[PDB]
Homo-oligomer: A and B are copies of this chain.
Amino acid sequence: KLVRLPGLIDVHVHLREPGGTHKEDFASGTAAALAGGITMVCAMPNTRPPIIDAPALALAQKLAEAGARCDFALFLGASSENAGTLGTVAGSAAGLKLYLNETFSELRLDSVVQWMEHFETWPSHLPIVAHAEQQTVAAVLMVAQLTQRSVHICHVARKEEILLIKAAKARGLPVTCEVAPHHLFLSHDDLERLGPGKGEVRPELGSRQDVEALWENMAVIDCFASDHAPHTLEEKCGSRPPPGFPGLETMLPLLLTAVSEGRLSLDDLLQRLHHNPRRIFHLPPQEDTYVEVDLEHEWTIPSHMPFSKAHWTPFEGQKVKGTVRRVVLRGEVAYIDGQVLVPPGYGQDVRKWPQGAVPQLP
């Protein structure tokens, strides 16, 4: 007996095209998404060139329209030079992305004044998301209050961060957040197995107490999102390993295992991979779209999943219970038992759909 789920949404993926296509491209990354039960992705702007201006966005839009197998929206990235310049294209993007700490990113800002300028100039009705770790979460929340608008915090990984967000929500502040599967299912304890290169990720893997705090505070977590961040094994195992884990193909199996163990409910999962992503990012429904999963099948995660060009996974060896059997996207079979059945270019930019425009006052 299969369970039918709606089309799941991953609001934080790195698809590497343009400019990093040996790591992933739209075609391979969206195949990975479909195999993970994900029918819509929001792609981050830290590509080469980075998506920080209208010409770069135009290029990325066409590459995505030609290569994507599932539907998508593309983030713009904040830079030290582009505040006040994105108004004409802002509504065509998933949202604006701010990189506020050291990570794999033309995009670190050098002053909180630059954060303020973005919060003041980006249209008030459109999403802003931040890579903001530890005290940076409190700092960006302050900027959001000074400019009287909301913010969404990416990949929350620490007890400190989730408790700060919890306190902010208790004061009625407009903040939402997401958590990635590696911060729920891996910890410092796994660094011995992973090694120092493979284990590199931002935010870094947390302590057992960090992981426990995220689970205990599930009510504070609005979304799950993979932060799918593919790099090849050669890069991860080399002399200056880039941070990041691939995750599209493993996220849903890990979370379904947790559902089966009673750690959260199926509804809790669907709020975090469907309803809350829709409402925070104003993403449209996908007609005749659904995912069928098998909750009984036990398997062990292999050394690499079939689709991502990363060709490795930090979850190797973990036992999971839960499998994606079939995905239907807009009336076409997109995935069955390991076979992707829609071509590159089947996917569409949801921000171009009438129902995908973000409503605003005249």
Q: Which residues in A have some Cβ–Cβ distance to B below 8 Å?
A: 100, 111-113, 116, 134-143, 145-146, 159-160, 163-164, 167-168, 171
Q: How far is the CB of A117 from chain B (nearest CB, A)?
A: 11
**In the complex, what residue of chain B is closest to A161 when comparing beta carbons?**
B112
**Contact indicator A167/B138 (Cβ below 8 Å):** no
- Cα distance, A142 to B140, chains bound together (Å): 9
- Which 8 A-B residue pairs are closest in the complex by CB-CB distance? A138-B139, A142-B142, A135-B139, A111-B160, A138-B142, A139-B139, A141-B142, A113-B163
Number of copies: 2
- Cα distance, A61 to B112, chains bound together (Å): 40
- Cα distance, A113 to B140, chains bound together (Å): 16
Q: List 12 A-B contacts (CB under 8 A).
A: A111-B134, A111-B160, A112-B134, A112-B135, A112-B138, A113-B159, A113-B160, A113-B164, A135-B139, A138-B139, A139-B142, A146-B168
Q: Contacts A138-B143, A141-B142 known; list 19 others, CB within 8 Å.
A: A100-B135, A111-B134, A111-B159, A111-B160, A112-B134, A112-B135, A112-B160, A113-B159, A113-B160, A113-B163, A116-B167, A135-B136, A136-B139, A138-B138, A138-B139, A139-B139, A142-B142, A146-B167, A146-B168
- Cα distance, A167 to B148, chains bound together (Å): 12
Most chain B CB within a 10 A radius of its CB, from A134, A142, A160, A164: A142
- Cα distance, A235 to B164, chains bound together (Å): 39
Neighbouring B residues of A171 by C-beta, 8 Å: 146
Neighbouring B residues of A140 by C-beta, 8 Å: 138
Partner of A145, one of B137, B145, B163: B145
**In the complex, what residue of chain B is closest to A110 when comparing beta carbons?**
B160
**In the complex, what residue of chain B is closest to A141 when comparing beta carbons?**
B142
Q: How far is the CB of A114 from chain B (nearest CB, A)?
A: 9
Neighbouring B residues of A164 by C-beta, 8 Å: 112-113, 116
Q: How far is the CB of A161 from chain B (nearest CB, A)?
A: 8
- Cα distance, A171 to B146, chains bound together (Å): 7
**In the complex, what residue of chain B is closest to A137 when comparing beta carbons?**
B112
Neighbouring B residues of A159 by C-beta, 8 Å: 111, 113
- Cα distance, A164 to B164, chains bound together (Å): 21
Neighbouring B residues of A143 by C-beta, 8 Å: 138
Neighbouring B residues of A160 by C-beta, 8 Å: 111-113
